[PDB]
Amino acid sequence: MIQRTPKIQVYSRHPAENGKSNFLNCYVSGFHPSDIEVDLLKNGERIEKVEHSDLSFSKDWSFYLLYYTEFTPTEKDEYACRVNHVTLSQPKIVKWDRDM
Amino acid sequence: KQWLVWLLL
Amino acid sequence: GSHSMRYFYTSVSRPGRGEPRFIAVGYVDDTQFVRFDSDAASQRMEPRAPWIEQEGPEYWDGETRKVKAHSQTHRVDLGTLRGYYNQSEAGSHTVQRMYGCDVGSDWRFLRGYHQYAYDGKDYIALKEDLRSWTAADMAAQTTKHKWEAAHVAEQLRAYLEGTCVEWLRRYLENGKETLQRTDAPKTHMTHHAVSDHEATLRCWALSFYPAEITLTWQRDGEDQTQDTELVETRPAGDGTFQKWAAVVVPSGQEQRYTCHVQHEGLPKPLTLRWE
């Protein structure tokens, strides 16, 4: 009955170095109920090989998941994470900040 | 290893 | 230092598909090592760490039977609470259970916890004395009584102070090379000019285990808790964690702010200052 909104963080497993193999990660935490849909976007179009962690929650009973994939960063390509939960009126999007 | 008892609410 | 084994269970009811969805995970400290997914074709307790595969097939059979039992009792708890709060069968609801045990540096029993929640709100907990219960609302009073009748407290305490801690020790000394470690953070600092008369100092601390970490900002010695952007400790994917903390700084005053870092891996805390 009482719903919490998801908190999203898009980031790379290791420092962004174009051309080197690396992992892209989208971490969602603090949301409830458990239902949620998450896609990863490569210049707009979504990816297909996107594994995820098992459902688990924190001490406040809010869930958290990790959606990770392998890739190679480049100069022009922009990656993003798209999330949708019940507490939203439209799919939320978050751009991967390679320089922060 | 996890608990062996069944616990109902 | 201090270690902990905690089990997490989540069961969500879906009228129209009958059997709820039931997911359970097991953690030692901040490392997941087991899993069970109801809608998985496996229908068995699968490993998620490499140091647990050493266990034979009997171990996995026992754990699978246990977790399936817990799934059943959850499938009953859903309907039971639906009756307690007088809710309709046309609504989805979530039942969450968490319980485990902790040990100190001497590898003895320090704490043990067990607690149920219904739709994100606390339903019933076990106080840290392991004898009495904490009941939230009138519905949980009935459960509290039922459990006080069957002496559930003494049994659960016998488990937490016995098997739980024992096999926590076993897990630690099996996966010693990963669970018994303290990876200090690799800190750095970035400085982005938000505007001509302002700036943002971001304090990065990444690649550290365990997840317990403290990361604060100070201006002239006092905490900037009111103006500090602080994300929540997030996983990296390789067993390490990341966290950063940013602050908004007037242009020309960077040398007044300092980033303080505390972690089990650092002998003494770290203090950083730009340039």
Side-chain angles (χ1 to χ4, degrees):
Chain A
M1 292 177 72
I2 60 170
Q3 300 152 337
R4 257 156 285 190
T5 183
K7 295 164 60 174
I8 304 169
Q9 304 185 54
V10 182
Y11 58 104
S12 55
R13 180 182 296 182
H14 303 289
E17 296 176 352
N18 64 34
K20 246 75 153 67
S21 174
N22 210 316
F23 275 95
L24 178 58
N25 292 265
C26 184
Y27 176 70
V28 179
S29 58
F31 67 98
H32 190 282
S34 54
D35 289 345
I36 192 169
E37 293 177 350
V38 184
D39 301 318
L40 303 184
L41 305 176
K42 176 186 175 65
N43 291 327
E45 291 72 34
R46 60 170 300 191
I47 345 260
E48 296 296 359
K49 196 170 188 292
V50 63
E51 293 164 329
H52 64 125
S53 76
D54 309 328
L55 190 71
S56 189
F57 50 85
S58 298
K59 198 191 76 178
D60 62 335
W61 312 99
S62 64
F63 301 104
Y64 61 86
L65 296 170
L66 171 61
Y67 288 70
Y68 54 103
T69 179
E70 197 185 58
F71 77 135
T72 61
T74 72
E75 193 71 353
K76 62 156 190 171
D77 291 334
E78 62 175 7
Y79 300 81
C81 185
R82 177 175 57 173
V83 177
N84 195 15
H85 187 60
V86 63
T87 64
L88 310 182
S89 60
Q90 53 182 130
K92 202 162 182 294
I93 300 174
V94 178
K95 299 287 185 179
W96 175 51
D97 204 336
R98 209 159 89 103
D99 181 308
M100 60 166 179
Chain B
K1 293 191 170 182
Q2 38 193 350
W3 199 15
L4 190 63
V5 182
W6 298 28
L7 193 61
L8 300 168
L9 291 184
Chain C
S2 45
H3 299 285
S4 60
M5 176 172 65
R6 302 202 259 134
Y7 279 97
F8 302 82
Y9 307 82
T10 303
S11 185
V12 178
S13 80
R14 49 189 179 182
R17 287 170 175 168
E19 302 303 340
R21 185 145 194 260
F22 171 86
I23 299 170
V25 293
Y27 279 75
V28 184
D29 297 339
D30 307 335
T31 298
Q32 180 181 347
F33 73 109
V34 286
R35 133 182 148 197
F36 181 85
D37 195 332
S38 175
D39 293 3
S42 168
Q43 286 292 323
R44 291 191 56 75
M45 199 87 190
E46 301 168 341
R48 299 295 285 173
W51 47 263
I52 191 66
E53 307 187 3
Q54 300 168 337
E55 300 296 344
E58 293 177 350
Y59 166 88
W60 294 109
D61 295 330
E63 295 302 320
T64 307
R65 298 190 200 91
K66 292 173 180 179
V67 76
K68 288 184 177 175
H70 287 161
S71 177
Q72 266 296 347
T73 179
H74 267 205
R75 291 181 189 174
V76 175
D77 294 340
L78 279 166
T80 304
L81 296 189
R82 171 189 302 151
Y84 284 165
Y85 290 95
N86 195 263
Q87 298 165 340
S88 62
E89 185 175 349
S92 175
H93 306 205
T94 312
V95 175
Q96 311 204 17
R97 179 192 189 171
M98 187 286 300
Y99 73 83
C101 53
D102 294 6
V103 297
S105 58
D106 61 356
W107 283 21
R108 290 187 168 181
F109 182 83
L110 280 183
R111 291 193 297 274
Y113 24 99
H114 174 273
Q115 39 207 43
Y116 271 98
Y118 186 52
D119 292 333
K121 62 180 68 180
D122 309 88
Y123 190 91
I124 184 170
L126 180 71
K127 293 177 186 173
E128 57 179 343
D129 63 355
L130 316 190
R131 298 296 299 278
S132 52
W133 305 89
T134 290
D137 53 62
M138 294 300 293
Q141 295 280 44
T142 307
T143 299
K144 175 181 167 64
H145 297 178
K146 246 177 71 184
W147 292 2
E148 289 174 1
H151 292 49
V152 179
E154 301 175 1
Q155 299 173 339
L156 178 57
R157 169 177 160 90
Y159 158 76
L160 296 167
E161 293 185 342
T163 309
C164 191
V165 293
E166 178 60 273
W167 279 88
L168 165 54
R169 306 185 201 110
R170 258 188 173 81
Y171 296 151
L172 289 175
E173 55 209 2
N174 281 339
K176 62 177 183 297
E177 291 295 347
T178 64
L179 301 176
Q180 297 181 22
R181 83 187 195 280
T182 47
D183 290 321
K186 255 165 284 186
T187 59
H188 73 266
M189 193 181 295
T190 52
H191 162 271
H192 281 349
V194 64
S195 173
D196 60 357
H197 76 99
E198 269 194 350
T200 56
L201 289 178
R202 184 169 292 101
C203 189
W204 288 93
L206 44 83
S207 308
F208 60 96
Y209 180 97
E212 182 65 25
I213 186 170
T214 307
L215 177 63
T216 74
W217 270 104
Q218 287 184 13
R219 190 227 307 188
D220 296 357
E222 278 101 2
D223 288 319
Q224 294 296 285
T225 179
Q226 298 179 337
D227 307 324
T228 189
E229 180 60 0
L230 188 80
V231 294
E232 292 189 353
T233 309
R234 57 203 223 202
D238 69 338
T240 65
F241 293 78
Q242 308 176 355
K243 184 163 183 152
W244 61 260
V247 65
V248 191
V249 171
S251 59
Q253 307 285 312
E254 293 82 351
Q255 317 301 123
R256 292 177 58 186
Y257 292 76
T258 76
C259 177
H260 289 279
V261 190
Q262 314 175 14
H263 186 255
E264 295 187 21
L266 295 172
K268 56 165 287 185
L270 268 172
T271 301
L272 307 177
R273 190 190 317 273
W274 202 65
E275 198 196 57

